[PDB]
């Protein structure tokens, strides 16, 4: 008979960079 299924594969590639962050706080008062 055919042998056992092979080992599971390796982990996949790292995911994409996340979305850009939120805007910063409003600037200092004039």
């Amino acid at each position: 008979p055919p042998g056992p299924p092979g080992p599971p594969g390796p982990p996949g590639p790292p995911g994409p960079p996340g979305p850009p962050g939120p805007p910063g706080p409003p600037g200092p008062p004039g």
Copy 2:
């Protein structure tokens, strides 16, 4: 015969943090 190929591996690591956000709005006068 040799067995079947194994199952796909686990999902990869989460991605890195995203880029910093934009500068905030200009301040009040």
Copy 3:
């Protein structure tokens, strides 16, 4: 019985990373 089969494929790409840091303060008013 036969030898174990080939290793499986690499897994799927991971999830997107976290949102990036908040941006810096805005320009002075």
